Amino acid sequence: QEYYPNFSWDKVPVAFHFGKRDGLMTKDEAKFVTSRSNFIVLEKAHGAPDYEYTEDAIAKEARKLKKLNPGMKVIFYWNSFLDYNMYKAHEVYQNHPQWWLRKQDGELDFKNKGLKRYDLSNPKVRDWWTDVAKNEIVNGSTDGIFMDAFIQVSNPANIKLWGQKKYNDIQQGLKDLIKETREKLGDDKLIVYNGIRSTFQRNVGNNFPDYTDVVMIEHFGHFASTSKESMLTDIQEMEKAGKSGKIVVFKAWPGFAWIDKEAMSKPYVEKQKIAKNSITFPLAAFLAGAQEHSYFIYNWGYRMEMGCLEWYPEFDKPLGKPLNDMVINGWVLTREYEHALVWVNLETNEAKINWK
């Protein structure tokens, strides 16, 4: 835990996860982020279109943030499944068509807009993929890697496309990729992966605990995880992961997301007002199960302009250390901090934070 970001219970622990379009962060934006958190994940296409390649922009942005805050942990986003076109490594991957994953019917496997999906069962793809992470991170400005799209790899709909045998090899290839990543990165670098996800159809927990330091709860109380059963599972997974020593990133939403076309057409001040009015329930749910090194993120997207730099009075109130563990009473969760008493009813979507 010596290479973890410095954690404190003094106020609500928050983290950042975004990519800024139209160049790197300004000095004011960099000061805002580094003075309020020690933990930021920089997304794909950060700095676009001013920076052609994500590797350059993230490396430069990490240096800028670390000048203001030497204790800042800056994470390099590197999708484990999808071949996005704004990296240098994308050009290398294009020159290896023999690597490209193909479905059962022999057709190339890709998502919409020609986004190829990696064949993680191929050791040559894994060695190239981990080489990209190593060359960017070790002896570099970043302190770790964000391996995304783990859930998409294990999606049972892939068995129809790949067949059971190919699906099993790809699942095992993902496990090897994580182990190879830790081998090349070393012991002093953080490994983040998109983990916990609770839905009616599938429940995914901290299912890759080996060699990893941070697990994300991306979809709390939103998308397909709005049910009381899903929300309780997400909060319990945070509590279980945190008690195991994991950093947990608890991503909450203001009742809407950037994929909502009608909500995105609202005035920005209306988005702020909705977000300001909708923070109590997800924050109380976070504080109910939050452990040491648990972090709260509250916005409506992964581009910086989608509320990522908004601030709320709840984030300035004293919090203090937790005095007890989470108490579950049916669908009602309670937690007591030194300066806050937390109450949340997942069934009725009601919550109250009694600051004191």
Residue numbers in the entry: 20 to 375
What's the publication's text?
DK169 contains an extensive polysaccharide-utilization locus that targets fucoidan from brown algae. Within this locus is a gene that encodes a putative fucoidan-degrading glycoside hydrolase (locus tag AAY42_01205) assigned to glycoside hydrolase family 168, which we call MeGH168. Fucoidan is a complex polysaccharide that is found in several brown algae species.
We present the 2.0 Å resolution X-ray crystal structure of MeGH168, demonstrating a (β/α)8-barrel fold. MeGH168 crystallized in space group P22121 with unit-cell parameters a = 47.27, b = 120.93, c = 163.85 Å. Analysis using MATTHEWS_COEF showed two protein molecules in the asymmetric unit with a Matthews coefficient of 2.65 Å3 Da−1 and a solvent content of 53.67%. PISA analysis indicated that dimers of the protein are unlikely to form in solution. Additionally, an antiparallel β-sheet fold, consisting of four β-strands, is present in the C-terminal region. However, the loop regions at the back of the catalytic groove have high variability, suggesting some possible contributions to differences in substrate recognition. In particular, an antiparallel β-hairpin in the predicted positive-subsite region of MeGH168 is likely to have a profound effect on reshaping the active site of this enzyme. The lack of structural and sequence conservation in the anticipated positive subsites of MeGH168, combined with presence of a large β-hairpin loop insertion, suggests that this enzyme may be able to accommodate substrates with alternative chemical characteristics in comparison to Fun168A.
